[PDB]
Specification:
Rossmann fold, acyl carrier protein, 48% helix, 232 residues, oxidoreductase, 16% strand, globular, FabG, Structural Genomics, csgid, 7-stranded parallel sheet, homotetramer, binds NADPH dihydro-nicotinamide-adenine-dinucleotide phosphate
C-alpha cells in the first residue's frame, strides 16, 4: 500500500521522451491511469503505444487555451477529472536575445503552468485531494524557471487547506538523447560541475515526481525538490 | 563618497512614493536624473520637482517604440544612461485563484518583460563605457501582505531570476545588476488606515513600523554608487525583518 | 523492488518517540535492520520492544565520543557497518537572547550540531568503502536564536559534506519538519492549537509518519541522485 | 549629513589587517570613534597607530568571556557604550571530514560562531537602552575554494536572522556581509596560474578589494540602513 497511485488519473505534459516518458511510465507502474501528451497526433499515438492499458496519449499545445480545454474535456469524459498534473512540457544571449525568444519561453514554460494549473484546480478542490508537480529542467530560461518556483510557493499557500499540494522538481544534468550527442570533451567538462561525477537518469527524476505525487507526500507543498547530484 | 556626479540615471515610474524618493535622492547625490510617467502631465510633474537636476518624460514600458524614443531623447540631450532603475512594482493585490489570464499577462508584461526590454536597450552603451548600474525595484508589500501579492509572485521571482542570470553575463564589463525588495512601506493607502489597523498589519514586521520611501531610495543609491562595484546578482531586502 | 531497504543497516538516533520512532518503524517496515537509540538503558529496551526481530535498541549519548564508539562497534560486530544514518537526536533550550545563558547555547551546539559532525564522521569510512551510503539529518523548524543557529549550521554542514562524498556513492541530506503532532503539541490547550494552525496553510499539523516517509524516500536507492538537499515537510508554512 | 557616523562608537573585532583593517579605517573616516581588536598587545598597538585620534586598539580574545568583559568595560568607561559592533574575527581549520579532528571542529565553532553569540549579547543591553544599534557579522572570505567553516558560517547566518527578529522593535539591526574572493596577503602569495583559475569562478573577472567589504559594512552601519535587518549582503562579483 506504500506510494500506491491506484485509482488516480495523471496528466503528464510532454511525455514523448526522456524525463516526461520516464515519469509517465513510473506513474503507470505505480497504478495511475496516465494520459501523456505531445504536440502532434503521431506523438500522441507513440505515447498510447508505450502505455497500452495503463493509459493513452493525446495531442496538446500548452500555449493554446482551446487545446487545453479540449484535452481536459476528453480526459474528464473518458477517465474522470485529473488528480495528478505533471507540467513537464517546455523549451529553450542577452545583448542579442530577441523579443520572440523571450516571449515564447514565458508562454511555453511559465504561463502554461498557470493555465493548466488553473484548469485542473476546481476538480481537485472539489475532491479535496490533488497533486500538481512542475518539472523545471539562458537569461530567458532562468527568469521563467524562477517564476515557476515563485508561482509554486504562492499557489501552494492558497490551495493547501483544500488537500492539494503544489511542488517543483528541479533536475540537474540528466542523460538525454541531446546530452548523449555531445562529444566526450564536452561530457567531461559538464561532469566537472557535478560532485556525483555522473549524469542523472531520467528514471531518477521520475522517482522524485512519483514520491511527491503519492499520499505519503501530503504535507509537502510549496517545495522545490532538487535532483542534481550535488551540483548546486 | 557615494557621489554620482556626471552620471545619467533613468528612473522609471517616478511620479510618487518610492519612485519619486529614488529620483530625488539620486539627484541630491549629483546624478542627472530622468524620471518617467505614463502621461505627459505625469512627466511635467516630475520635471517640476527635479528642476535643474533633471527632467521628466512620458514612457510606456510595454511599448518598444516608446522605449526607443525615450532612450534616443535621453541620449541626444544627456548622453547614454549610466544608471537604470526599473520600477518593476506596479501591482494591485489579488489571489492566484481569482485572477484571470489578462491580469496575469499584464503583470508579466509590465513587471517582468519590461525589465528585459529596458535592460537590453541600455546595455550596449554601458558595456562600451565599461561602467553601468541596473537596479530593479520590486513592488511594495501592501495591507494584505504576501498573501495579497500572490498575483505578482511569479513576476517578482522572475525579475530576481533574470537579475542573477544577467548579472553573470555582464559583470566582466563593469555593469552590475541588482534587485531591491521593499517590505511594507508607508504609502498614501497606509496613511489612511486607523492606528488599530496599522498595528495589525505591523504584527508581521519585527521592526514594528513601516519603512519610509527614502529608505528604499538609500538602498538604491548605495547600489548605484562606485562603492558597490563588487555587488551584483544580489537581492537587497529592505523590510524591517519581515518573513 | 521499489524503495526497498532489504539488507541495509540503519541507525536512527533518538528513536524513543514521535518522529524518531516513526522513522525507525518505517525503515523496518521497508526491510532495513534498524538500530534505534535512547539516552538510557530502559529507553533502549523500549525501542527493542517495538522493533522486535527487525532490529534492536541501544543506549547512546551523542555528545560523548566513547558512547559513540562503543555503539558503533556493537553495531558493526553484530550487524555489519551502518548503511543509513538518521541523525534525529536533538533538544531545545528556548529563551530570549537577552536572558540566554552560556550553557543553553553550548548544550544546543553540542547536542544538535557537533553531534552531526561526530556521528557522520564515524560512519563515513564504512560507507565510502562500500561506495553506498545515506546520511539524513532531521532538523525541526521549531526565543530560539540558539536552536536557529544550530539548525542553519546542520544545513551548511550538509551541503558542504555532500560535496566531498558524493563521488563515492554517499548522499547527505536534511529533512526539515514544520509543526508536527507530538506529545508536546497534544498537551497544549485548544486556543493555543488554533493559534499555531493559523500559521499553517494546510490547516493541520503534520503526522510523524509524514516525516518518516520523507526520510525513507531519501534513504532509498531511488534517491541516489539527491544530495546536499533540504526537503521541507511543513504543509506550506514556509 | 549622508551615511555619517559622528558620535557613534564602533567596535571592530580582528582589525589588524585586510578586511578588518579596511572596515575600521572606513568607519573612522565616516566619523565613528573606533576600537579595533587583535589577539595580542602588539597587535592592539599597531591598530592604535593607524587610527590615531579616531580611536584605539585593544587586545581581545573572542573565545574568552573574561577578555570580552574587560574590553567592554574599558570601552564603556572611556568612550561610552558600543553603538556599532562588527564581528570580523575568525579562523579556518581545513580538512576532509573523514580526517577532521574534534579540536579543528570545535575551535571553529568557538571562534567563528559562539563568539558572535557572546559579543552580540554583551552589547545588546546598552544598544536597547539607547533604542539604536548595529551589529554586523562578516562571514569571511572564500580562499581559493573551505569545508570546516561552512557549518559555522551558515550558523552565523541563522543566528543573524533569528536574533534580528527579537531585537528589531528596539532599533537594533543585525546583518551579515558575505564576502566572495577578496584580495588578501594569502591571495597575493599564490602563483599567477592559480589566480587565473580562481578568477574563472568570478564573472566580474577580478578579486574584490577589502575596501569594498568596508563600504558594505559602513552602509549597513549607517542611519540610512535602519530598515534593513536579518539580511545577508553578498559582495562577491557574481560568484556562484
Ligand atoms: O525536452 P524534450 O524535447 O525531450 O521534451 C520536452 C517536451 O516539450 C514539448 N513541447 C515543446 N513545445 C511545446 C508546446 N508549445 N506545447 C506542448 N508541448 C511542447 C515536446 O513535445 P513534442 O515532442 O511534441 O515536441 C516534448 O515532449
Ligand atoms: O501608482 P503606481 O503603483 O502605478 O506607481 C508607480 C509608477 O509606475 C508607472 N507606470 C504604471 N504603468 C506603467 C507602464 N505601463 N509603463 C511605464 N510606467 C508605468 C506609473 O505612471 P503614472 O504615474 O503615469 O501611472 C507610476 O508613476
Ligand atoms: O522527543 P524529544 O524532542 O523530547 O527528544 C527527542 C530525542 O532526542 C534524544 N536525545 C536528547 N539528548 C540526547 C543525547 N545527548 N544523546 C542522544 N539522544 C538524545 C531523546 O532521547 P531519550 O528518548 O533518551 O530522551 C529523544 O529520543
Ligand atoms: O590575513 P587576512 O586573511 O586578511 O585576515 P585573518 O584571516 O588573519 O584575520 C583574522 C583576524 O581575526 C583575529 N582572530 C583570529 N582568531 C581570534 C580569536 N580567537 N579571538 C580574537 N581574534 C581572533 C586575528 O587577530 P590577530 O591579528 O591577533 O591574529 C585577525 O585580526
Amino acid at each position: 500500500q506504500f506510494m500506491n497511485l491506484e485509482g488516480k488519473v495523471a496528466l503528464v505534459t510532454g511525455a514523448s521522451r526522456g524525463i516526461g516518458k520516464a515519469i509517465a511510465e513510473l506513474l503507470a507502474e505505480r497504478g495511475a491511469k496516465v494520459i501523456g501528451t505531445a504536440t502532434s497526433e503521431s506523438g500522441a499515438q507513440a505515447i498510447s503505444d508505450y502505455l497500452g492499458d495503463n493509459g493513452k496519449g493525446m495531442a496538446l499545445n500548452v500555449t493554446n487555451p482551446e487545446s487545453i480545454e479540449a484535452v481536459l474535456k476528453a480526459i474528464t469524459d473518458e477517465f474522470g477529472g485529473v488528480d495528478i498534473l505533471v507540467n513537464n512540457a517546455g523549451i529553450t544571449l542577452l545583448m542579442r536575445m530577441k523579443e520572440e525568444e523571450w516571449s515564447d519561453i514565458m508562454e511555453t514554460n511559465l504561463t502554461s503552468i498557470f493555465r493548466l494549473s488553473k484548469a485542473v484546480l476546481r476538480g481537485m478542490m472539489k475532491k479535496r485531494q490533488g497533486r500538481i508537480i512542475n518539472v523545471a529542467s539562458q537569461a530567458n530560461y532562468a527568469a521563467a524557471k524562477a517564476g515557476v518556483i515563485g508561482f509554486t510557493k504562492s499557489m501552494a499557500r492558497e490551495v493547501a487547506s483544500r488537500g492539494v499540494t503544489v511542488n517543483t522538481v528541479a533536475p540537474g544534468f540528466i542523460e538525454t538523447d541531446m546530452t548523449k550527442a555531445l562529444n566526450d570533451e564536452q561530457r567531461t567538462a559538464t561532469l566537472a560541475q557535478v560532485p556525483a561525477g555522473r549524469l542523472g537518469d531520467p528514471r531518477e527524476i521520475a522517482s522524485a515526481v512519483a514520491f511527491l505525487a503519492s499520499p505519503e507526500a501530503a504535507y509537502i507543498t510549496g517545495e522545490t525538490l532538487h535532483v542534481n547530484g550535488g551540483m548546486y
